[PDB]
């Protein structure tokens, strides 16, 4: 099946993606650093349960979340992708996982694939966005407004 | 875990239509953001005018997303400033080009992507732009979006094109040119 | 003046002289095609020292990235168009120099291990994505196999060459973890 290669492709396209953006990080021991290569070990998962996923790493992108959240401000501006290097490239990552939940979901709805997978993927770009404003912030970079 | 209303697949428009992640609409909107975000990254490689060009569109790259994301099958009244897509934008890129155009060497030869950071970046951003473009185009010719998100993508591969030649040859960097 | 304006309204032509709407499988085989030599052409700035061999590789194979983009232009049905086998064959000498000087490889490499070879596992996710763009192509007898043939051989040394780049910087490159 063609969706299929599509879907583990696009995954894999995402965590390279991911790749580069972590050799971004320039100083030594950031935690999120540590997680998103535990997120690209899920993705190779992700790739082969494509080719049952526990709902896990969901729950643990959740509660990064979470962590991140109530260490920024609340979200008042449309942001443009911005905010830094490392931020810039989480942005990036976030437009390629999104376009890998759109390749995943036809496969689940089929019933091909764990309904996790997509969750995950969902999940996964709330993790991103917020991943990069909790960068920029950390560089205390200030990220690019929204005007017409 | 949380229960997210995208969990089972599904997304919304601005007009309020519930679809599948798959449908057009978001696989064209998902890349314009994926476009604009590209731009971010290039963005931070700006060692400047242009630098306040790339932002205008990425602003504008907002603009076709609420475009797209609002069918004009169902756009109402109150989403009319949605649905129309004015061509200011492209006229801009326009008068940009010519601009950079005509501080740059005359062109006759097949450019590599190269040309310094900035520059490679820019004709990634390019290629992605094209992806936008071939996204955008069966939501044009189906009536659902304007045709001047279609005129601006078009135009802006070109403006990324020209900028990137711009940004090469204010660092005294080649382009590699085709061979054989 | 660089723009026509004739594809404004979203419809371009094929080497052939037909015109077609731009989402048609051929023009998001080509673009797919450019995004792949874009995205060599950012690693390649990633390079520091001068006088690399694998740059100039690189480069080459931007150039045949520019054929495959005129070969997939052309559909067969509607002309008369054969790729070479010969950059390939070249890509299959170039993937026995790098392999051979590696470490024998049982895990499972995560995209990392470097600037250069973090820009390179990116590049052959690219490439993968051409090959699955040129798939359906071949497949309906619009382009030569060798077409897919070279991108398929390229995804290989896209790899191979980012396990190369990793293991000449020392920088170790980050296993699959349960
Ligand atoms: N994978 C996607 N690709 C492109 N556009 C998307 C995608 N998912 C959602 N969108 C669009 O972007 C908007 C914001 O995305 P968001 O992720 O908040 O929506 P969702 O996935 O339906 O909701 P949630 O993430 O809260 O479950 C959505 O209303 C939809 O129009
Ligand atoms: N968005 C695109 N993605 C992929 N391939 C394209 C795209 N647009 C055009 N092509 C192909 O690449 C060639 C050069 O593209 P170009 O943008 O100059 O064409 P166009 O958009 O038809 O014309 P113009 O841009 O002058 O209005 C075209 O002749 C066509 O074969
Ligand atoms: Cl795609
Ligand atoms: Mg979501
Ligand atoms: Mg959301
Ligand atoms: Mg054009
Ligand atoms: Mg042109």
């Given at each position: ?50 080719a049952t996923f526990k709902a896990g790493p ?65 999940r996964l770009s709330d993790y991103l966005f917020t ?18």
């Amino acid at each position: 099946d063609d969706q299929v290669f599509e879907a583990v492709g696009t995954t894999d396209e995402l965590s390279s993606a991911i790749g580069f953006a972590l050799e971004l990080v320039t100083e030594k021991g950031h935690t999120f650093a540590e997680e998103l290569q535990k997120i690209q070990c899920t993705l190779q998962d992700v790739g082969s349960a494509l080719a049952t996923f526990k709902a896990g790493p969901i729950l643990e992108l959740e509660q990064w979340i979470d962590k991140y959240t109530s260490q920024l401000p609340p979200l008042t501006a449309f942001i443009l992708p911005s905010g830094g290097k490392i931020s810039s490239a989480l942005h990036f990552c976030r437009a390629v996982c999104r376009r890998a939940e759109r390749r995943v979901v036809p496969l689940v709805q089929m019933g091909e694939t764990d309904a996790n997978v997509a969750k995950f993927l969902n999940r996964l770009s709330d993790y991103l966005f917020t991943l990069a404003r909790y960068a920029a912030m950390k560089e205390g970079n200030q990220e690019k407004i929204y005007m017409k």
